[PDB]
Amino acid sequence: TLANEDCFRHESLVPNLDYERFRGSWIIAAGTSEALTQYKCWIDRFSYDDALVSKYTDSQGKNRTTIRGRTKFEGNKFTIDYNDKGKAFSAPYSVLATDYENYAIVEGCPAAANGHVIYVQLRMTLRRFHPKLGDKEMLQHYTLDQVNQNKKAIEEDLKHFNLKYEDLHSTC
Structure with a gap:
């Protein structure tokens, strides 16, 4: 059970997370796990x-x-149960903080992160993402720009969990 899930280390600032507003596509910018840098x-x-x-x-x-x-x-x-494929990533997870529209901070316990990770994600939407002719670093520039637009809010929430963005591994 998620009710009895013991691997979370932090108390969420959004215990009543609105799943419908949280849904959509999200790009992971950075996290505390070296193994997930792959x-x-x-x-x-x-x-x-x-x-x-x-x-x-x-x-x-x-x-x-x-x-x-x-x-x-x-x-x-939330739990994710991946198919056979991606089993190393099946785990419990917890949204620690989000403004829904731009960013979220998430904790979880996948085997692939050696049991524990906190990561920062930015919303991925065609409303903000205009792919171009010849952008080799397409995702990368998107992610950095979106991090930078929401940097104060991201830093404030992270600080609440004794983290700073510059201590995270960049994963895009």
């Missing part, structure tokens, strides 16, 4: 009642990977 520019798309599609690449944009799973939310807490 999976670059990770995008999680939460959809409908409980669908999740997650997409990433390696460090040279090679080996594009998609994994698909099912979520279950109880307030801020």
